[PDB]
């Protein structure tokens, strides 16, 4: 019935939420805005984008923020007639330190006008809100440990949440330290039985990743851990097509059954290449996936063992399927940008990114370069599949070399590649390719540029990714097509290729304008096509 | 019976060889001269060494040579009345290429006048000379691929040796590429019931090391794979104390039994740190430990699941100890050296190290700084256990900051650490503190170095390891020590640490001399002690 | 009249010697076999190489020994109607220790039979021998401090020599500490007028590079330093062709004219680059160049400002050119090699490079990589010209991809370039190009090699130098040529782009041939061509 991933493409950190027969995933968004994507699904199968709740500068503020900051792990729940929406800034993700907060933001329907946040603390990322039987809540997440002789990950912090007082009382305890594995996160509580049960995210969002399930009386523990921990991982299957298994969250059905959702990355074809020596680069980030649970003994297990399963039996439930929610080619017709579009940290208004000015065109007004983490006149969608092209034709006239327009692959700030049209002194207005590399940057089609002539209106760009390996190719008719002759590389496009280790996204596909001048020139996007190929 | 490893501290790369009731282990040197270790045994349990083949120039020449280069595995065998011994030299252990030549020598007693070398091959290292049953000979070696896109371990070529001719004869095959581990190396070939069993090392020899067994009908195979592959790992078993266990030789016993030597890595303490995150530090090197084998199904299986035990079970024998073969406090009255003491790479004459100059005392007349490949003057034992003391008790009369005797933990020539005797131009002789962290060097008793009177003969140098830490001491009397207020760490001094991977050996502790200026200044060592605990 | 440089290409530190009415200048030559280059002149204008005094491995045994180890600055003198060459061999090159030794051999005549080396000191390099008025001979050397807190260069160390004894005799004593500019070494000592005269260099041998004289009536000092400090330095003047001007050495000539050889970097064009960022890279290494001495107040001026002239007017004598003293096609029909071809550290034997094997062919027989710093099968010549095109013709028939023949752009074992003949499974015999930037090798026509048919028996190399880049291209004829589609860079091949500083030779081009294998296959060269364009 259901094959992993459910979620394809950069959708790590799921938050499962049951409301009836109604079920929710909240994903994390880093620092792409608006921060939050909400899923929604009747037989855990077949999910629809229902939300983005994190649209409003008093929720989210990113300017700045470093790349692989803002927007970690989410929880989403629902209690008392509302859903509650816990997330975090995170604005250093390098160093002894990992500084960000806490807020929660609550709305009666998933797609509504969510609140401006409650700040509730900022001692460490992965918070959790839980609604225990008597009424009341408690937060849990991670506490963090800067101090240089010590492992970061101090442990799982609980604390009672005052919905009246609207803030933290008592006083925070830690509840679980965690296993060996360490790196404890993602803490989740669920009353199920006598239990009070602790799912934490261990081992690293790398390979080394697990689930790992504790149970207590008290809520303040001491809670026993799973005596066949790890719940999940992949880390001893390194054949399994699935990595990374961990950062679930439990959900129990309406007919009575169990699932666990988690995140993994998909390495890309590994051939010939060492098993063990590197376990492989995911473009696709981490995405999420499904795994069926059964009981045994008090305890919970995955079905297939503690490896995740690639196919599993859904719920018994009726298939309830899902109209596709974006056009192939999108025309740039509707009045609101389609909403698997995002922008780098803010929100774009008119005078960056406009349907108005030019109808039928997403008009990009020029703003900063691609290595800027402030404001970026781009819009874009994410990679969700190891084979597809995407497409885009571009009006766009640029007077001089710091102005540029094209069709970027993008992973952060120091990590892209781009097929643009610019300016140069003697060619006019040229294409080239340009490629970001942990900031060190080529032309790799210096000086042997696409002249464009005068009389070209359009420029067609286009990209066929081809798992991986992708190419470039342009059009100034949009039926003879030219490839340039450089063949690019999609791990470094992936998480794994990033040095800093704070790569939490995945590969984009956009649509970018430059003007470094600061003459306010535009680009005008005719048409973005994605196909899965 | 039998607790592992049974050769403690560097010892990689065991090759067992069987000749009736007698057995021997030739371990890996490197750098470290003379070449080759071999011990001996009756019972598989206690292990006297008896051999160190490769000490004259003619057989191995390694001046110059880098780190961890020289004596990779060897090989040893017995057939047709004599000892067959294939060792490699090798040059080149940075980069693309592995430059690296084999040889066979032989001798009809174990610890005789091995021959002069027979050059064989330098297509790749891990050579093993394999005597079939019809009385021909092969050597198989692993095959080296130096191309920019290409998994350089290109599996195992075969050649037969012709013995009448002194040299290898017809065309050399690839006869296995390997597991999807690959780092294929380690070859060595049995006849045992209707097949050719192929033992390969794979994985490469730090956390993912394995052996693999593989068996054909035909010589040259193709081979089958043990169906339950590796044969013996400690990757899957992150908890145990033997890890990177792989790099095998089989012993088929006069009892009829079978067991496997192998090479292992027993971490430093690492409580509280992740578990899988990084897997341990060790500063002993590469060990040698021993499991038991059954066959089942015309596969050989590691008893105790496919990981290695701590403890097994020895063959069916009387146990033969031996007697303990090294002074705990070595006075230095013999006429040789105690056969723990290496040198490196090249011997040292008595122009350099001499018990003769001064009776009851090891004279070092100073060569060339701890960082040269060339000549040291320097006399070293390897770090055997995780707790002990060595001393040592030094009479030296610097006139220059250029000239130093001391007492050195050494890894490379770029790692170490010393208590060193110098001359400061204020307060003459000195006694000081000297580090080495990748060529990085240190003084923490930069200006506090400790004054020694000129009425004082004999500077009494100690160090103190205790696992993760050790701290050096020192006396003028010998009865009262004053520790120096630096706190070193062994990690520092383990394979793991070591940033180039060419990090193959473990750590010595030793007695040094150098002069810089060329007065042929000496030091004086009146006794060398070593003790567990 | 004289322009410089005199001695094109890698000619560092130079060492002149008047006889009567002949000049003769020595260079460092460092892992380049046979040790020390010297040349010989009337009118000091035209210079032909006229000795190779190390030829000996019992003079010069290098193997092993680091990049621009081996032979340091040399210094050549006559007295007591003999020769007496100076040299190091300079062991460690990194570090805090640059361990080296200093020898002393001699020579009734400049081409004959120089003896065996006398040991002199080890306390730094730089050695140089003074003949006092008196009959004693003194050694200078610098005086190596390698404490972490201390500047390296401790100044000059001066220790008389006795003949009689061959050693050195009495207490060393630092005669000299240098001026602010540091790094004071190259000490030579002249007696002229009633003072001893030392002169140094001083700022290191890059774009701070000066020539520093001192005097003092007493040898042992206090000396006073030359009022306008800097002798000769190219430090003040950027736009100077000639760089780097220091290590210099006094020539008093038989007409009353006194002139002052040094070395000199001339950096290749750097039109558009900003001036004073970075001064430059020299793939000719660091040259040989003459200026004109004149005196006031009893110290010596550089004719024309402290800066070298490229042209200067020499002594008055009647100009005798020498016979060019290598052919521009090299069809290998003598029975020894061109004294232009140097060796990797070692020299070659009959085994490894013949030209009696084969009539009209160099026979080089396969041994390690261009990355080994032992058996290197290759023989080079020094790049003199910017502009020049070098080319072989081959004979080679490998079986495998571990060989390999071809045509060699050479700095040191961790940068290179060529153009290649090798195997390949698919393809068979092919031509390919391999770069190796600091150890990382490129491949740039992977999977777009060249097939060499079966018919053909000859491969035509060849490199075409045009200052900032170079070109390779081969042939199958010798008449219709075919450039391979890259374009090398040839600052890669520098002093200055080696980031480990030790960068003290030039790029070589020659004959390289590699057997991996061990099966002393064999490329077979017919021709080694020359030509400056
Ligand atoms: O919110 C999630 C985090 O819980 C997760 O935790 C760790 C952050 O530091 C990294 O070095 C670790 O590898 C990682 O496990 O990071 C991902 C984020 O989605
Ligand atoms: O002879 C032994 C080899 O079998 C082995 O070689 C490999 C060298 O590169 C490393 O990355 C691999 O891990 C290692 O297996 O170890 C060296 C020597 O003991
Ligand atoms: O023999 C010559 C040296 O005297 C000379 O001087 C210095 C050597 O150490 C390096 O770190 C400095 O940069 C250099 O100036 O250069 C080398 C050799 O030609
Ligand atoms: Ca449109
Ligand atoms: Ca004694
Ligand atoms: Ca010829």
């Not at 997330?87 to 509504?112: A, M, P, S």
Request: proline fraction near 6%; aromatic fraction near 14%; charge should be negative.
């Amino acid at each position: 019935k259901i094959k992993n991933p459910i979620l394809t493409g950069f959708h790590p950190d799921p938050s499962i939420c049951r409301v009836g027969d109604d079920y929710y995933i909240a994903v994390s968004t880093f620092e792409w805005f608006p921060g939050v994507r909400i899923y929604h699904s009747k037989d855990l199968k077949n999910w629809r984008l229902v939300a983005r709740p994190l649209n409003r500068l008093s929720q989210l503020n990113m300017i700045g923020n470093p790349d692989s900051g803002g927007v970690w792990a989410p929880h989403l729940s629902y209690s008392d007639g509302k859903f509650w929406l816990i997330y975090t800034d995170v604005k250093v993700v390098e160093g002894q330190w990992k500084d960000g907060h806490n807020y929660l933001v609550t709305c009666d329907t998933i797609d509504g006008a969510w609140s401006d946040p409650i700040y509730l603390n900022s001692s460490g990322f992965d918070p959790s809100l839980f609604h225990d039987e008597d009424g009341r809540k408690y937060l849990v997440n991670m506490y963090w440990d800067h101090r240089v002789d010590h492992h970061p990950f101090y442990g799982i912090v609980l604390q009672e949440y005052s919905v009246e007082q609207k803030k933290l009382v008592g006083e925070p305890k830690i509840i679980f330290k965690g296993t060996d594995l360490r790196i404890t996160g993602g803490p989740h509580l669920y009353k199920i039985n006598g239990y009070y049960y602790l799912l934490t995210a261990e081992g690293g969002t790398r390979y080394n990743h697990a689930a790992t399930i504790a149970r207590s009386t008290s809520l303040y523990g001491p809670y026993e851990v799973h005596p066949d921990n790890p719940l999940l991982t992949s880390w001893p299957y390194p054949r399994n097509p699935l990595q990374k298994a961990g950062h679930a969250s439990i959900v129990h059905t309406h007919t009575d059954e169990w699932f666990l959702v988690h995140l993994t990355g998909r390495p890309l074809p590994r051939e010939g290449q060492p098993l063990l020596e590197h376990r492989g680069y995911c473009p696709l980030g981490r995405e999420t996936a499904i795994q069926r649970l059964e009981w045994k003994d008090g305890w919970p297990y995955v079905v297939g063992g503690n490896g995740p399963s690639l196919e599993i039996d859904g719920p018994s439930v009726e298939e309830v399927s899902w109209e596709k929610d974006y056009d192939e080619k999108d025309d740039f017709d509707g009045d609101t940008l389609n909403h698997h579009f995002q922008t780098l940290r803010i929100p774009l208004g008119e005078d960056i990114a406009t349907l108005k000015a030019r109808p039928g065109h997403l008009r990009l007004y020029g703003r900063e370069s691609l290595t800027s983490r402030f404001t970026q006149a781009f819009v874009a969608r994410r990679w969700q599949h190891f084979h597809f092209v995407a497409e885009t034709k571009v009006s766009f006239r640029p007077t001089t070399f710091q102005q540029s327009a094209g069709l970027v692959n993008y992973y952060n700030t120091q990590n892209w590649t781009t097929l643009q049209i610019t300016w140069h002194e003697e060619k006019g207005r040229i294409l080239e390719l340009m490629t970001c590399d942990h900031l060190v940057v080529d032309q790799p089609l210096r000086g042997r540029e696409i002249v464009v002539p005068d009389d070209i209106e359009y420029v067609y760009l286009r990209v066929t990714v081809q798992a991986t390996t992708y190419k470039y190719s342009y059009s100034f008719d949009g039926m003879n097509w030219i490839d340039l002759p450089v063949t690019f590389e999609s791990y470094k496009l992936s998480d794994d290729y990033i040095k800093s280790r704070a790569a939490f996204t995945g590969a984009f596909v956009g649509m970018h304008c430059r003007d470094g001048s600061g003459q306010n020139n535009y680009a005008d996007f005719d048409y973005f096509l994605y196909k899965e190929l």
